[PDB]
Design a protein around this ligand. Sequence first.
Ligand SMILES: NC(=O)c1ccc[n+]([C@@H]2O[C@H](COP(=O)([O-])OP(=O)(O)OC[C@H]3O[C@@H](n4cnc5c(N)ncnc54)[C@H](OP(=O)(O)O)[C@@H]3O)[C@@H](O)[C@H]2O)c1
Ligand SMILES: NC(=O)c1ccc[n+]([C@@H]2O[C@H](COP(=O)([O-])OP(=O)(O)OC[C@H]3O[C@@H](n4cnc5c(N)ncnc54)[C@H](OP(=O)(O)O)[C@@H]3O)[C@@H](O)[C@H]2O)c1
Ligand SMILES: O=c1c(O)c(-c2ccccc2)oc2cc(O)ccc12
Lengths: 260, 260
Amino acid sequence: YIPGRLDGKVALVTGSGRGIGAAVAVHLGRLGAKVVVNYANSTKDAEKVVSEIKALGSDAIAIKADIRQVPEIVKLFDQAVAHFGHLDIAVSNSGVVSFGHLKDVTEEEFDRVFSLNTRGQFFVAREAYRHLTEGGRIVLTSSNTSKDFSVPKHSLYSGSKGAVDSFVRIFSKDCGDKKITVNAVAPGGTVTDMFHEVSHHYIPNGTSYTAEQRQQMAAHASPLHRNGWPQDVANVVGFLVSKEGEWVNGKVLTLDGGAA
Amino acid sequence: YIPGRLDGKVALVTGSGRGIGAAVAVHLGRLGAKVVVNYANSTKDAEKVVSEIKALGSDAIAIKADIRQVPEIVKLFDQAVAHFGHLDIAVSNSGVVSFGHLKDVTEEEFDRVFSLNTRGQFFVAREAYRHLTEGGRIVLTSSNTSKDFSVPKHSLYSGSKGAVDSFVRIFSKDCGDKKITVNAVAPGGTVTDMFHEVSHHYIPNGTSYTAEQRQQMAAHASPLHRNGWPQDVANVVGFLVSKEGEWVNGKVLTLDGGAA
Ligand SMILES: NC(=O)c1ccc[n+]([C@@H]2O[C@H](COP(=O)([O-])OP(=O)(O)OC[C@H]3O[C@@H](n4cnc5c(N)ncnc54)[C@H](OP(=O)(O)O)[C@@H]3O)[C@@H](O)[C@H]2O)c1
Ligand SMILES: NC(=O)c1ccc[n+]([C@@H]2O[C@H](COP(=O)([O-])OP(=O)(O)OC[C@H]3O[C@@H](n4cnc5c(N)ncnc54)[C@H](OP(=O)(O)O)[C@@H]3O)[C@@H](O)[C@H]2O)c1
Ligand SMILES: O=c1c(O)c(-c2ccccc2)oc2cc(O)ccc12
């Protein structure tokens, strides 16, 4: 039993077919956990992550569930436990980004973002609490924009993740009766499909720079002069879900390489 | 020199038939503003607040609108402006509280709380931005539980108000193009109808004390050894919405008499 390792444990990661979730899933597998790879649309990518986790010597299964639908969350966790027998670690990663001036945010856009980023994560946590073994781990995903980084026209998203920050602090109090810790990671700009989709909103006149230039400017936001990568987030989740992370509980760790 | 008056201004307060909203509405009237008193159910109480504002020498009208319904928000603001000619100040105060261990929180309870506390306030802000005159003021309502105070079985509510904290910081960036400031007040335990919902949870072992004892214990949580009252919040909103409050922008002010 090596320190920081997860041998014999079972982890579930939402939205782990690609992006940050994919890194987290492969990493938990690398640490020796068996992994449930949840996806909503990226079936082939989820299979690739599963194949990669098996190739590094662990086991994994891909399970489709739309995390906007609470009954599908319940089913996801039921299927997870049915397959591996038990569940120790739940990482809630699924999310969507949005931009718009307050004046033009519609009801439908509010609901598209909150239903996944906030409502979905809340019920992923609920189901995690119900299904997890004593001494388990829950990690939710927030963002540096919730508290540390203020971007015009980003109010909906920033708020969606501000709620998650508050959740984890109080979740840790409730989840303590099963000795489960609850934390969140709040990444800054991390190079994924989402990054490239929206990097132009984070930069003044972002549209008149190339996509590569925009990534390079995000690199210079950190005093380390490099971009955040999915592995950066995965490294921290892996520590939080280990035995050694136990005393970190009820906290949000901003992961922006010192940009804030 | 008389600081902080609002003569010639028009203010709208959601949920101002009773509680904190009532005190805010009466106070804005005391400062010289004309006031739109929104309520959802408390018709008679809204009439009492209107009467009180007229007694103080200002003018007011009560308008029914369910702030969960975005079309009713739009109408509320349209009617406000049609009646008084313009609108300068919007205070979003309507909210409900909730308690429950994470394991027992249902979809319906999530939606009951978020639809008013987070979604409702978000669209009150949107409509406020659209309808306010240049140089106006928006104030939303959060809670000490979002960031400063951690209460078991209070995750849903704490998160509903954490989202608001994030909103106001970014709202201030968007609203700056009409020179409108946006802030929130985050009260601690303030003696209203809601206080009776919260008091047994905000006091250690609150369940083994009388309601009067709980209020006394809540008083001893402040180093000033008294309870928070609606007027305490009203005093701060009044300053934030005055000319003199301008440089407070994008902030959440916790109002707990030094308990945090
Ligand atoms: N990347 C950044 O710079 C950054 C910064 C701060 C915070 N974050 C947060 O980090 C998390 C992941 O972001 P990312 O960069 O990996 O974004 P991404 O590349 O767009 O990936 C999004 C992930 O969310 C999943 N997803 C989308 N809709 C879903 C649904 N309805 N049900 C279940 N899963 C769904 C997607 O799975 P499918 O493709 O199968 O739908 C995918 O796995 C999000 O919570 C995001 O808010 C990202
Ligand atoms: N009191 C506390 O210790 C405390 C502490 C922290 C934060 N807060 C926040 O302070 C704000 C004021 O609360 P309070 O203490 O005054 O609570 P309260 O006595 O329960 O008053 C609730 C107010 O919300 C209004 N409201 C409820 N549902 C509504 C709806 N659908 N549409 C429009 N208005 C609605 C109610 O009006 P109707 O009767 O007409 O429905 C009433 O005016 C809330 O946002 C609350 O979260 C209160
Ligand atoms: O997609 C993002 C992004 O491109 C960037 C970004 C891109 C270029 C410069 C600075 C930031 O930041 C983010 C921060 C977040 O909390 C979430 C997403 C992004």
